[PDB]
Design a protein around this ligand. Structure first.
Ligand SMILES: Cc1ncc(C[n+]2csc(CCOP(=O)(O)OP(=O)(O)O)c2C)c(N)n1
Ligand SMILES: Cc1ncc(C[n+]2csc(CCOP(=O)(O)OP(=O)(O)O)c2C)c(N)n1
Ligand SMILES: *[C@@](C)(O)P(=O)(O)OC
Ligand SMILES: *[C@@](C)(O)P(=O)(O)OC
Ligand SMILES: COP(=O)(O)C(C)=O
Ligand SMILES: COP(=O)(O)C(C)=O
Ligand SMILES: COP(=O)(O)[C@H](C)O
Ligand SMILES: COP(=O)(O)[C@H](C)O
Ligand SMILES: [Mg+2]
Ligand SMILES: [Mg+2]
Lengths: 562, 562
């Protein structure tokens, strides 16, 4: 019993729970794609372009664990590249498979379409190696199952993009089916016993001594799977728990000990103080980007900083190479309650609010929206926020427990979120058909990736697409050129996007007032994810969350340098 | 008197006749873009995404001589790379300007947005250099004016994309205005007199001996500026003249000595016979790609092949390095009427210029449409055909003299032409507003880049957008997977796209029959470019011009072979 190499690929992906495959067809991958239909459960999204396909592979991997996008040599791959880079930047495990010209076309340097016309078949592979954890350009059938397994493990474990090139002529060759009976090894190796035990004792002593210890969960807590441990640590220690913007959603915001979003100097006065006064910081998965830290504005001076990281740990000035956080946290948690039993709980900053009631005629403002969105959310929602006012405003929104956030704070590619939403809707559907996928995207960002709405429609996916109509690039207007033509956009009939892409069962509604907002969002039928929905949210052109106004200025200054 | 470095950039582009600037803003390019408005006549397009911007810059340069897309560090520039790669593949001089972090941001390796989180500011520049003729990352103001000139010259002269990175802090520093008073050198080095003389004596001698000489114009005749020389060569020799698919438009098809489109084995029998029985082939600008040549199908029955190229000449088995075609043809022209004086003109092929009468109710078919296109075209038209049935079908359309064709036969990135259309239409409006820009794009291709229609509306541009609705990817269906779900697309309402993107003054009409076709296209008001039009052409799913049917099969077999 034998299967095609293409077949093997799809069977392996299914074993790591990839059910939906992203990308676009081309002659160089059509035989490969045939195999998808031979694997029970697997489907082909049918994306509207390769850039959006890669954004969607990203959103899907964030929920599902990993994902796979297939493109065609040259023109498919190169289109995906900004999607792949972003997955790299943000530690998202995306397997990028490219259908390439058969080996005999390559050997004989055929002047083929999608080449640069110089007979170099290695160029695109070479470009992609710059943004991949590892790569394979498969030429040898005898090692190919092993290479694919290597690419999958690396994608899954490292959580970085991997590039797999497959000649069209290789994909139809057979491999023994029994190769599939043995699972890919998807584990990490255990820590060094001595190194890890020294980390533990060290952290344990620091905790025993600390009067005002605080926990801070950042991006890599989320990206590298330490969420269950960080949750236990908060429960067992009762230390105040804070979250960065890039880690929003990785810790539960309705826990009695949750103190807020810390963004250095842009934090609320109570959060800034509760954090910066700590005599011990337990940091989980720091990723200190400009926007994630209010332009590098942390101010603690203390030490007793413990940094947990995927592959090492830092304690004060010391680094412990190879001490991986997931196992180190697991081991820590068996002794942490005793270490902390002398801790008298310091009070945490109290949550923001509810908006006060206002006249129903009151026009919508950014500040009011971000607070209100908290009344709409429920446990288990996926909340996706575009770079722009949306990404900044969500910080102030209070998540129910078990809310999965998606915000590309480091890469910051506008338009990402239309595709991330498609891929998240696919993932959610396979996880739990009642989990809601809720997108906030600006009117400008939508334009770059709008066609991926079509793919959501063709699969009957049912996300909520909040479109923030503020007449252009408000985030950019706040940085430079408040009235510059380059910050304006052609205005679109947003309510027409859905039926134009062929939707038949949908809602498209415009909200301009608090009354319209509330009427829509408190409606029981609206709250159920029974159809795709677009909500055009009319806002003032220069209205922004206060943190964005501050940041816009910090950023402007940085660039103009001297 | 001093101007900003940014200003200097734009005054330079104005001197090589770039009036429209493509791309998207981003914080690292905003200061740069301010200067556009400081230079009389220069405009910023405001594209809907960077890939589309890059496609539009390509279309722009094909018409104008060169173009400029400006993007932002990481996220803009990576999004544009497929467009740039296409420009490199097809020899189009696009200058790619990237606004990048200030010099000391890079020096201090700040964890900024749009980086890979690893401190490497060189990686995107390194990626672009694989698909660039040269690059510049500007760091020094004293040398920036010269580096910019070096870039523009290379772009213009080599007709390939150039990469130019401008740190955000440098673009406001100033340079002497007087610099602009010395022209960039835009000229070619001349040929070696001795090597050129050998070439010419050789060709002349062959011409004197030929009874059946023929001329074959190909892609590099247009890309490398030899169309004037080639027209004169046809005039003075009276030899039969043929064009390849990729060079279509580069020679006048209503010339009495025009013999048709040669595509090796995919040629009409009269054309294959006319060319292959030749006893001399004067080949101008050969680019022998799969789709250009019926899968490398040429069967010249002579050894007397002369290949002119930008940088060398070939005669029979001999290569003449450095013998440049523009110059060698100019020299050839001075003696060639005399070498050819004893030539008795052999008759040239044709096909019917016209379709048979049919019932007006006749469903539209590809073969009928492509012949019928010829009755609608006028001299001065720009004819843009997408990869798919459009690009193969146009080969059977008869051009009026002075028809400019754009068909990306080598690179073959679907979606290209929506962008190329925007940029051809800008260019054409600057050249002569009476020049119509006429697009043929499939339902599938349109999906990848549809948002760029928005940018046409914004600027009041008046292309004719013929959209071929055959319910999916017909060209792929003929390659493999006739009814595969991967060759199927979500169905759009093409008639609604234009209002949806804010069009006020426009037409959108569906045509299904020959009579609806004739009614619309023979209408005098329709034939005037006074508004943006979309024509939705309804065609059968498996309907294809017969050339594409054969080519799909060869390609299939090329991809399968071991
Ligand atoms: C791919 C890409 N191109 C350009 C940019 C630069 N950029 C950052 S924010 C922004 C504008 C966002 O506009 P919108 O989505 O309308 O957000 P809001 O008006 O709510 O601020 C742009 C163009 C980017 N981040 N990514
Ligand atoms: C960016 C990109 N992705 C994938 C391909 C592979 N490809 C070539 S033709 C084609 C289908 C185009 O279909 P359509 O425009 O509807 O043309 P038609 O049906 O008239 O043949 C595809 C997906 C490509 N050339 N470029
Ligand atoms: C994250 C950047 O903190 P990590 O170090 O865990 O990621 C690899
Ligand atoms: C064209 C491919 O013939 P060229 O040789 O002029 O290109 C540089
Ligand atoms: C988070 O990853 P999973 O274990 O869910 C998987 C095997 O995909
Ligand atoms: C100097 O302008 P050019 O002639 O170079 C042009 C046609 O762009
Ligand atoms: C080239 O073959 P194909 O995959 O049909 C598309 C043109 O790329
Ligand atoms: C980050 O700066 P910006 O240019 O506004 C966009 C997010 O890049
Ligand atoms: Mg906006
Ligand atoms: Mg089609």
């Amino acid at each position: 019993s034998e299967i095609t190499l293409g077949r093997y690929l799809f069977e392996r992906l299914k074993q790591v729970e990839v059910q939906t495959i992203f990308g676009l067809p081309g002659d160089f991958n059509l035989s490969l794609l045939d195999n998808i239909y031979e694997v029970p459960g697997m489907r082909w999204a049918g994306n509207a372009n390769e850039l959006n396909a890669a954004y969607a592979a990203d959103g899907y991997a964030r929920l599902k664990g990993m994902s796979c996008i297939i493109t065609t040599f040259g023109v498919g791959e190169l289109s995906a590249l900004n999607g792949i880079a972003g997955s790299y930047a943000e530690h998202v495990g995306v397997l990028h498979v490219v259908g390439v010209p058969s080996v005999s076309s390559q050997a004989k340097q055929l002047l083929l379409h999608h080449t640069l016309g110089n007979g170099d078949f290695t160029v695109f592979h070479r470009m992609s190696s710059n943004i991949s954890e590892t790569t394979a350009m498969i030429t040898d059938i005898n090692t190919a199952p092993a290479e694919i397994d290597r690419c999958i493990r690396t994608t899954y474990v490292s959580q970085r993009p991997v590039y797999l090139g497959l000649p069209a002529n290789l994909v139809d060759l057979t491999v023994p089916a029994s190769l599939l009976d043995t699972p890919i090894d998807l584990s990490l190796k255990p820590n060094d016993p001595e190194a890890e035990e020294e980390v533990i004792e060290n952290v344990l002593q620091l905790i025993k001594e600390a009067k005002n210890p605080v926990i801070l969960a950042d991006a890599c807590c989320s990206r590298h799977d330490a969420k269950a441990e960080t949750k236990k640590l908060i429960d067992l220690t009762q230390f105040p728990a804070f979250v960065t913007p890039m880690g929003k959603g990785s810790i539960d915001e309705k826990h009695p000990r949750f103190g807020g979003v810390y963004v250095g100097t842009l934090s609320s006065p109570a959060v800034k103080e509760a954090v910066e006064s700590a005599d011990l910081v337990l940091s989980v998965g720091a990723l200190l980007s400009d926007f994630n830290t209010g332009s590098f504005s942390y101010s603690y001076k203390t030490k007793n900083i413990v940094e947990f990281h995927s592959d090492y740990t830092k304690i004060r000035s010391a680094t412990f190479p190879g001490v991986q956080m997931k196992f180190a946290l697991q081991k820590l948690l068996t002794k942490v309650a005793d270490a902390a039993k002398g801790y008298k709980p310091v009070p945490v900053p109290s949550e923001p609010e509810h908006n006060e009631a206002v006249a129903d005629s009151t026009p919508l403002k950014q500040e009011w929206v971000w607070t209100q969105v908290g009344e709409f959310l429920r446990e288990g929602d996926v909340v996706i926020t575009e770079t722009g006012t949306s990404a900044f405003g969500i910080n102030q929104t209070h998540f129910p427990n078990n809310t999965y956030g998606i915000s590309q704070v480091l890469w910051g590619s506008i338009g990402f979120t239309t595709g991330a939403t498609l891929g998240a809707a696919f993932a959610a559907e396979e996880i739990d058909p009642k989990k809601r996928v809720i997108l906030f995207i600006g009117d400008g960002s939508l334009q770059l990736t709008v066609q991926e709405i079509s793919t959501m429609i063709r699969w009957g996916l049912k996300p909520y697409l909040f479109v923030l109509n503020n007449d252009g690039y408000t985030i950019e207007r706040l940085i430079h050129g408040e009235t510059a033509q380059y910050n304006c956009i052609q205005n679109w009939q947003h309510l027409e996007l859905l039926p134009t892409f062929g939707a038949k069962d949908y809602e498209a509604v415009r909200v301009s007032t608090t009354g319209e907002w509330n009427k829509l969002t408190t409606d029981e039928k609206f709250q159920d994810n029974t159809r795709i929905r677009l909500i055009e949210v009319m806002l003032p052109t220069m209205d922004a969350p206060s943190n964005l106004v501050k940041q816009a200025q910090l950023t402007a200054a940085t660039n103009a340098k001297n």
